[PDB]
Design an enzyme around this catalytic site. Sequence first.
Site, PDB file in Angstrom:
ATOM      1  N   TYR A  12       0.989  -1.311  -0.022  1.00  0.00           N
ATOM      2  CA  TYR A  12       0.136  -0.184   0.165  1.00  0.00           C
ATOM      3  C   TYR A  12       0.665   1.361   0.163  1.00  0.00           C
ATOM      4  O   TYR A  12       0.512   1.965  -1.005  1.00  0.00           O
ATOM      5  CB  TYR A  12      -0.955  -0.119   1.277  1.00  0.00           C
ATOM      6  CG  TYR A  12      -1.801  -1.063   0.865  1.00  0.00           C
ATOM      7  CD1 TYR A  12      -1.960  -2.285   1.311  1.00  0.00           C
ATOM      8  CD2 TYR A  12      -3.145  -0.843   0.279  1.00  0.00           C
ATOM      9  CE1 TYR A  12      -2.883  -3.559   1.086  1.00  0.00           C
ATOM     10  CE2 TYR A  12      -4.273  -1.633   0.064  1.00  0.00           C
ATOM     11  CZ  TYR A  12      -4.012  -3.108   0.457  1.00  0.00           C
ATOM     12  OH  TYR A  12      -4.906  -3.724   0.344  1.00  0.00           O
ATOM     13  N   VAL A 242      16.278  -5.997  -1.207  1.00  0.00           N
ATOM     14  CA  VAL A 242      16.934  -5.070  -0.812  1.00  0.00           C
ATOM     15  C   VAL A 242      17.557  -5.557   0.494  1.00  0.00           C
ATOM     16  O   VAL A 242      16.864  -6.119   1.480  1.00  0.00           O
ATOM     17  CB  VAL A 242      16.387  -3.560  -0.584  1.00  0.00           C
ATOM     18  CG1 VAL A 242      17.414  -2.815   0.012  1.00  0.00           C
ATOM     19  CG2 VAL A 242      15.922  -2.808  -1.846  1.00  0.00           C
ATOM     20  N   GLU A 353     -14.074  -8.441  13.158  1.00  0.00           N
ATOM     21  CA  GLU A 353     -14.642  -9.036  11.999  1.00  0.00           C
ATOM     22  C   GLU A 353     -15.346 -10.253  12.244  1.00  0.00           C
ATOM     23  O   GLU A 353     -14.638 -11.023  12.764  1.00  0.00           O
ATOM     24  CB  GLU A 353     -13.145  -9.321  11.291  1.00  0.00           C
ATOM     25  CG  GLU A 353     -12.980 -10.175  10.214  1.00  0.00           C
ATOM     26  CD  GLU A 353     -11.613 -10.093   9.505  1.00  0.00           C
ATOM     27  OE1 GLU A 353     -11.179 -11.205   8.783  1.00  0.00           O
ATOM     28  OE2 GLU A 353     -10.733  -9.384   9.923  1.00  0.00           O
ATOM     29  N   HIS A 439      -2.083  -7.662  10.982  1.00  0.00           N
ATOM     30  CA  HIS A 439      -2.191  -6.344  11.014  1.00  0.00           C
ATOM     31  C   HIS A 439      -0.886  -5.568  11.707  1.00  0.00           C
ATOM     32  O   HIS A 439      -0.975  -4.920  12.561  1.00  0.00           O
ATOM     33  CB  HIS A 439      -3.443  -5.537  11.418  1.00  0.00           C
ATOM     34  CG  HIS A 439      -4.636  -6.236  11.038  1.00  0.00           C
ATOM     35  ND1 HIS A 439      -5.632  -6.157  11.782  1.00  0.00           N
ATOM     36  CD2 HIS A 439      -5.060  -7.042   9.727  1.00  0.00           C
ATOM     37  CE1 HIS A 439      -6.952  -6.729  11.141  1.00  0.00           C
ATOM     38  NE2 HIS A 439      -6.180  -7.328  10.160  1.00  0.00           N
ATOM     39  N   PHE A 479      -5.364  -1.296   6.049  1.00  0.00           N
ATOM     40  CA  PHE A 479      -4.901  -0.651   4.861  1.00  0.00           C
ATOM     41  C   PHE A 479      -5.390   0.458   4.306  1.00  0.00           C
ATOM     42  O   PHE A 479      -4.914   1.243   3.747  1.00  0.00           O
ATOM     43  CB  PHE A 479      -5.048  -1.796   3.734  1.00  0.00           C
ATOM     44  CG  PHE A 479      -6.291  -2.139   2.878  1.00  0.00           C
ATOM     45  CD1 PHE A 479      -7.102  -1.255   2.141  1.00  0.00           C
ATOM     46  CD2 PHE A 479      -6.601  -3.409   3.257  1.00  0.00           C
ATOM     47  CE1 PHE A 479      -8.059  -1.845   1.672  1.00  0.00           C
ATOM     48  CE2 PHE A 479      -7.736  -3.831   2.531  1.00  0.00           C
ATOM     49  CZ  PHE A 479      -8.716  -3.002   1.470  1.00  0.00           C
TER      50      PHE A 479
END
EC number: 1.1.3.6
Length: 498
Positions: A12, A242, A353, A439, A479
């Site tokens: 994101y 990286v 949820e 999360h 998000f």
Amino acid sequence: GYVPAVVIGTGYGAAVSALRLGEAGVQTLMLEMGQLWNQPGPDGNIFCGMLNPDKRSSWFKNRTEAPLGSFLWLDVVNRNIDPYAGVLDRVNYDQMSVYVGRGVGGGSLVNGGMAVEPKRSYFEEILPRVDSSEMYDRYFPRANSMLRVNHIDTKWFEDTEWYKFARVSREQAGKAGLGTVFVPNVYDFGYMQREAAGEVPKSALATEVIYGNNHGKQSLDKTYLAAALGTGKVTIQTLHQVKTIRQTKDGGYALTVEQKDTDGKLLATKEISCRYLFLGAGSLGSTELLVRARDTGTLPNLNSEVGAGWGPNGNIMTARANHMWNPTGAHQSSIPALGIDAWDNSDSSVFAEIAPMPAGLETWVSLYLAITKNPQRGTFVYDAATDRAKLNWTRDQNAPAVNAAKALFDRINKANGTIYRYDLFGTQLKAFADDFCYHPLGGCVLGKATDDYGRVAGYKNLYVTDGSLIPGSVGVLPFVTITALAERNVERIIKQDV
Ligand SMILES: Cc1cc2nc3c(=O)[nH]c(=O)nc-3n(C[C@H](O)[C@H](O)[C@H](O)COP(=O)(O)OP(=O)(O)OC[C@H]3O[C@@H](n4cnc5c(N)ncnc54)[C@H](O)[C@@H]3O)c2cc1C
């Protein structure tokens, strides 16, 4: 070589940053350690589903795993697999397992698509230095639109067998005086209605989500990243990880970058340099790069807040056994549509949820992923011996999260005469899973490790863009907040810095 801007990762924060950089005319290279998910696999599909997991389900594991909550029914389909660059990575720390996406689009590939703005008063509590009117007036709307957030049809929801599980929990919560909310999503709900009618290939209605959706879900490769590529100024190199970041003698940043194949073999190590460097490697990945750079001397001016302030968004999983007269259905859409909102910003706050279960037979189980307000935080500390950032989080630090989740679901059990399940997470009696996270939030917190726009303290033209900025909690599915924050940040950075 050299490219004006580099973005690490393609989640994101990364996707928003690269779109706006490309639109500003800045040539931009994104480096993603996972794959571009676009090759049909042995079943003709890009992704595996939850009842047929294979090596695509897992980032370098030698055996598949059941979705959390469903081991009792789905262990039967687990199989040994070759370690492979698959889509979902369970990252194990000492007393916490953090689940993250690996691939072009990051966690948008494996998540439930749930797009929720935080409570404005809570946003103001957690980020008092950020102007909340611009967030709610401009950046949250901008994020909702670009993400292609949509809303379920309420008549279809009320009628369809695919959401019976949600309606049962709504009824049960209602008897305890607790209400539910519809949760917006990036999964196309018109497509989902067509799945149920047998009109298009199923995905959400064919037990797919956590290892990717072969249809319906508008993950970032379809929204922000597709647009970023459309600018003509952005390219994405995959299977490029990286490893180190340094400030070059002549200015800018230099990276060591490993290219691997999907079996994890090292193909090449490259040096890539840039003028502007944006980290969107996630709460775990961006924090690890910066703790490593500080403690190995390559970015020696990083401050002591790098690494700190991590929390799992108060994540706790729990489950209730329904009465035999309240079956939740054998057919459960894999995309949640309802939550219980009992979040008032007090310490008893819960936003939960109502989670579907993929077993595909009647189990009478109601599953919840609770989001709670727990002040405990951990720290990523660099281990030079293994060259890894270890998370200093202990399981007792989740006791406040467990207690808030239990007090809420105890109310529901009391009103309905039901009990918890105790066997969904392991052999010992455990009604609350307290050592996972979907999360991860923090590690490079906005205003502490960085300025109020993600500019890393101690450095110029060095930015962090993602969930590592958030101070451990947002009280909802994160998000949309990460996206909106990144919209605000890159707009300012391009205006004042680029
Ligand atoms: C099972 C599950 C369900 C969830 N459901 C929801 C939901 O419905 N709604 C919600 O709001 N949130 C959901 N979440 C959380 C949400 O997906 C994450 O909060 C979000 O993706 C975080 O975005 P990010 O930009 O911080 O990083 P990420 O999306 O994690 O992306 C980071 C990217 O960087 C790449 N990377 C990492 N390190 C390197 C490196 N060194 N070099 C190169 N590339 C690198 C990673 O491979 C990845 O592609 C879910 C998560 C999971 C796992």
